[PDB]
Structure formats: structure tokens, C-alpha cells
Amino acid sequence: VMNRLILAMDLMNRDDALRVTGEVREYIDTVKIGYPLVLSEGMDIIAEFRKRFGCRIIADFKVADIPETNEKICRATFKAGADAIIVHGFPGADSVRACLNVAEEMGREVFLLTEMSHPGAEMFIQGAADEIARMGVDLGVKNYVGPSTRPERLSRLREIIGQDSFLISPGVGAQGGDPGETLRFADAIIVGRSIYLADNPAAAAAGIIESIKD
Amino acid sequence: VMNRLILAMDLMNRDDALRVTGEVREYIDTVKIGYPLVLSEGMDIIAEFRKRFGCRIIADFKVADIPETNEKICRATFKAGADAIIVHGFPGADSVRACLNVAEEMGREVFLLTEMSHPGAEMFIQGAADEIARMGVDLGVKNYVGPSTRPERLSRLREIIGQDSFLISPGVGAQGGDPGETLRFADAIIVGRSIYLADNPAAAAAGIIESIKD
Ligand SMILES: Nc1c(F)c(=O)[nH]c(=O)n1[C@@H]1O[C@H](COP(=O)(O)O)[C@@H](O)[C@H]1O
Ligand SMILES: Nc1c(F)c(=O)[nH]c(=O)n1[C@@H]1O[C@H](COP(=O)(O)O)[C@@H](O)[C@H]1O
């Protein structure tokens, strides 16, 4: 991922999302698009971004349904041009394998979300997260998401998935995570508000990149 | 809910979804629309259904993000005209309260998903589900989802949320759940494929209603 930095583009109107993404494009290779933007502007926004910026797109849909519904969500998402989809592990192995099967059919990839970055993740997700990660390994998952806000958890998750797996990490900036500490364990960081709410998003991106080039 | 039966409309093209929903409308009051249909046809499908059928709409989005993202997803969903949204409890209390706050602002309702109906729910969700339900009660949640496929779990969940709470239950028909047994505990059942894949969806709906009128 260019500069190890993934933009979380959670602005909800197309003109602002296009402006900010264009402004920071010299600093990123990869944009995470989630439901805030997709439910406001439509699934066609994925192909628009992919074309206009020549960026890879991760669909952050935190897929969390039964296997049959997960299969449908994944097929619609890859049809729309997404390169990868984020899938929750908490609903269990059959729900994850349904997503992996569609990704295998469509030549796409699944990111398994293990532990989440927000405080409420401590209630139920954290206690299951090591086991969710192991389940991923056992299913052949190669791409994972884990929390910038808890680098000791991010270290453990790295220890389970091994060095060859690809690990991306949200919670940097607004939620309190640090770029450099997070990159001790993750391959790339995800950053939303610290960039997209900045008075100068390009300067904010450049500042983050500076802080991690060294 | 009319006849205690909620249609899970998971067909992915608008013409088929409109046909089947129109055919079974004399038997239902309430349609659950999820991401299979919304990601294929757009969020405008919610208002279209609400107008064309004069049905209530539950947006089955199994919201499962951090509080800030959950707030956005809920606002976009209620803006599109949904009456209610299904929210996962597994990400914890702050993520649920974010949805409750937007529902309170928009005059809408949240359904808390406790235990899911598919086999993989046994891995991580089932062991947390009683505690998820209690958390709902502690947050003032009045509407819940629990599994037709495990009526002993559905009985326990009813015992936690009490008799005044409203409980809906998927997993009837295709997944193995029984309409009448499920309605010992749930106020309404959710049915998808057993209706929408039937050669005659109206006859399938009518058959289910017959089996539970007695
Ligand atoms: N995908 C995520 C997770 F798995 C997770 O555990 N925590 C997250 O924040 N996100 C997303 O990452 C972004 C964080 O944005 P920012 O805080 O503004 O920098 C948002 O899109 C979140 O929905
Ligand atoms: N909302 C759900 C849950 F919380 C859950 O635990 N299990 C489910 O199946 N659904 C949804 O209920 C419907 C079940 O559809 P059918 O099997 O064809 O009858 C689908 O839309 C599922 O996504």
C-alpha cells in the first residue's frame, strides 16, 4: 500500500469525497469505502473512485450475516468493482467461508476483522479475538484487520497470523492510535477523520507520511 | 405485525422483488430489506417499497461498526425511509447506543440482534448472547432478534428481555425452524426463501399463516 497509508473515506456526499480523495491521491494507493458513503451515494461510487483515482478499493462492509446472505453481499460488492471486502469473524467460520468462496470465484480478497478499535470492543469481541484470528488462519485467510488503539493486542494478533499475513489497522489519529507504534505490527494504517476533517487533507496526509518515513 | 409474519425480501433484482412482495402483500404488514437488495438496486428501493405496498420496512443492515460510523449508517438509513434498523450487539454498548441516539433523533427504532440462527453462531455469538440481551435491557432496547433454529435459546432470550419487549425471529423454513414453535416465544417470524423461492409465494405465505392461526 503506497506509503503504508489507507484513506478511510467516510464523507457522505460525493463532491466532498471526490475533492478530498483527489487532494490526497499523491500520498495513497488505497481507499477504504464504507457504508456511510455507499448508502448516501450508491454502489456506483466504487467504480467511479477506482477509475478516477486508479486506486484500489477496500469495501468496508463488516459483513456479519448468515452464510447465504454473506454470499450475496460479497457478490454484489465485487460486481461493483471492489478489490477486497472486510468481513467480521465473530459470526463464525461458515459465514467467513461463504465470503472466501465468493472471493475465490471473483478473483478478489477478504479481510478478516478480528478485534475492533473502539471501547465497546472490550465487552465481547476482545475475549473472542485471538480465537477469531486462529479461525482465520485455519480457513486460509491472508488479510486481517486489528486495532491501532491497543498495540499489545495488535502484537498478539500478529503473533497468531504470522509475518506473511497482511494486517491493516484503524483507530489512528482521532481514536487515539499512533502511526509509528501501529506500524511496528501492522503493514498499513487506516486513517479517516485526521485526514478528511483537516483544514488541509493533503498536509495532514503528508504529515503522517513524514512521521513514518523515519 | 400482520399475521405475525415478516417477509425477508432478499431477491436481488427490483422486478422480481416487486413481483413477489406484491403477490404476498395481503398476508404481511412488514418487509425486511437487507443489503442483497439494497446493494443491487440502491437505497431508493426502501421508499419505493414503503410507498407501493404501504408496508413498514425493517432495514436489516446488522450494523456492526464503531459508534461514529454506526451513527452515519443509521442516519442514512432513516433518511431513506426505513422504520427500523437491525443492529448487532456483539460490538458492545457504545456502538449500540450510537444507533439508539440516532433513532431517538429521527423518531425510529432499533432491533438488537442477540444470537444468530446459523450454525457458526455457536462459535462466538451464542456464548455472549445472554449478556448481549442483558446489555440491551440496560440500554432501554425494546426490540430484539433471536434464532428460530434454537427455541431453547429463544426461550432464554425471552426470559431476559421480558414479555413487554418485541422479539422477531429468523431461521424459519429454509434454515429448519418451525413457525408455530418459534411463535411460542417470538412475537413475529421472519421468512425469506420458503416464500420468495416458492413456485407460488402467495400460497407459501398463506400456508404458513394457516399453520399458525390454529
Ligand atoms: N474498519 C474499522 C474497524 F475494523 C475498526 O475496528 N475500527 C474502525 O474505526 N474501523 C473503520 O475505520 C475508520 C476509522 O476512521 P477514523 O477513526 O476517522 O480514522 C472508520 O471507517 C471505521 O468504520
Ligand atoms: N436477520 C437475520 C438474523 F439476525 C439471523 O440470525 N439469521 C438470519 O437468517 N437473518 C436474516 O433473515 C433472513 C432469513 O432468510 P431465510 O433463511 O431465507 O428465511 C435473511 O435475510 C437473513 O440475512
Side-chain angles (χ1 to χ4, degrees), chain B:
Chain B
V1 156
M2 180 156 79
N3 292 307
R4 298 177 79 179
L5 179 60
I6 297 166
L7 175 65
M9 177 36 63
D10 299 312
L11 295 170
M12 296 177 72
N13 71 83
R14 175 173 167 278
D15 288 336
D16 298 332
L18 290 169
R19 176 190 81 248
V20 171
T21 307
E23 284 170 358
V24 306
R25 181 55 186 86
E26 83 195 82
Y27 303 105
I28 71 178
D29 198 35
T30 306
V31 180
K32 190 176 72 61
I33 292 180
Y35 285 136
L37 182 55
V38 159
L39 302 182
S40 296
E41 296 288 359
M43 288 289 276
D44 286 350
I45 201 78
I46 290 167
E48 183 175 12
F49 263 58
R50 214 167 146 283
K51 183 196 168 183
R52 280 182 48 100
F53 307 117
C55 55
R56 290 284 180 195
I57 302 296
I58 298 170
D60 180 14
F61 291 177
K62 293 181 178 70
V63 184
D65 217 303
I66 70 168
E68 288 85 350
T69 298
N70 279 10
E71 172 189 350
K72 287 171 174 176
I73 293 173
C74 292
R75 189 173 316 270
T77 298
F78 299 139
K79 177 171 178 181
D83 299 282
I85 194 171
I86 296 175
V87 175
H88 265 294
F90 205 88
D94 53 357
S95 287
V96 177
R97 176 64 73 194
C99 300
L100 292 171
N101 289 340
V102 178
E104 177 170 3
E105 291 177 58
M106 292 185 89
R108 301 304 221 292
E109 301 177 280
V110 164
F111 279 77
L112 186 67
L113 173 53
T114 63
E115 183 170 329
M116 287 182 73
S117 61
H118 64 297
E122 288 180 0
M123 289 184 66
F124 309 109
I125 290 167
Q126 182 174 83
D130 285 4
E131 295 161 77
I132 289 171
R134 176 66 64 197
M135 176 191 72
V137 172
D138 291 346
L139 295 171
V141 173
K142 295 308 176 198
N143 304 292
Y144 295 83
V145 188
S148 174
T149 50
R150 304 189 195 89
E152 85 287 18
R153 295 294 303 128
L154 195 69
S155 176
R156 177 73 109 273
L157 296 160
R158 170 60 74 186
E159 184 195 334
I160 293 163
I161 68 176
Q163 301 301 320
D164 71 299
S165 291
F166 187 72
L167 172 59
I168 70 183
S169 183
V172 177
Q175 293 180 58
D178 180 74
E181 289 294 295
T182 300
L183 291 170
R184 294 173 61 202
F185 309 110
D187 300 287
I189 51 171
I190 291 162
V191 180
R193 283 168 287 172
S194 288
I195 294 168
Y196 73 68
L197 295 180
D199 285 338
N200 186 338
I208 287 160
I209 294 170
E210 282 187 296
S211 76
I212 68 176
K213 259 172 180 162
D214 53 42

Side-chain angles (χ1 to χ4, degrees), chain A residues 14-208:
Chain A
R14 175 173 167 278
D15 288 336
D16 298 332
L18 290 169
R19 176 190 81 248
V20 171
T21 307
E23 284 170 358
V24 306
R25 181 55 186 86
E26 83 195 82
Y27 303 105
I28 71 178
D29 198 35
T30 306
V31 180
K32 190 176 72 61
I33 292 180
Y35 285 136
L37 182 55
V38 159
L39 302 182
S40 296
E41 296 288 359
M43 288 289 276
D44 286 350
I45 201 78
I46 290 167
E48 183 175 12
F49 263 58
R50 214 167 146 283
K51 183 196 168 183
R52 280 182 48 100
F53 307 117
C55 55
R56 290 284 180 195
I57 302 296
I58 298 170
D60 180 14
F61 291 177
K62 293 181 178 70
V63 184
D65 217 303
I66 70 168
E68 288 85 350
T69 298
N70 279 10
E71 172 189 350
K72 287 171 174 176
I73 293 173
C74 292
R75 189 173 316 270
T77 298
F78 299 139
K79 177 171 178 181
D83 299 282
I85 194 171
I86 296 175
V87 175
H88 265 294
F90 205 88
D94 53 357
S95 287
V96 177
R97 176 64 73 194
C99 300
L100 292 171
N101 289 340
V102 178
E104 177 170 3
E105 291 177 58
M106 292 185 89
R108 301 304 221 292
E109 301 177 280
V110 164
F111 279 77
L112 186 67
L113 173 53
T114 63
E115 183 170 329
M116 287 182 73
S117 61
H118 64 297
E122 288 180 0
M123 289 184 66
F124 309 109
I125 290 167
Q126 182 174 83
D130 285 4
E131 295 161 77
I132 289 171
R134 176 66 64 197
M135 176 191 72
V137 172
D138 291 346
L139 295 171
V141 173
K142 295 308 176 198
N143 304 292
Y144 295 83
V145 188
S148 174
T149 50
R150 304 189 195 89
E152 85 287 18
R153 295 294 303 128
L154 195 69
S155 176
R156 177 73 109 273
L157 296 160
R158 170 60 74 186
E159 184 195 334
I160 293 163
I161 68 176
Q163 301 301 320
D164 71 299
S165 291
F166 187 72
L167 172 59
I168 70 183
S169 183
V172 177
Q175 293 180 58
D178 180 74
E181 289 294 295
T182 300
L183 291 170
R184 294 173 61 202
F185 309 110
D187 300 287
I189 51 171
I190 291 162
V191 180
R193 283 168 287 172
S194 288
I195 294 168
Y196 73 68
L197 295 180
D199 285 338
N200 186 338
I208 287 160

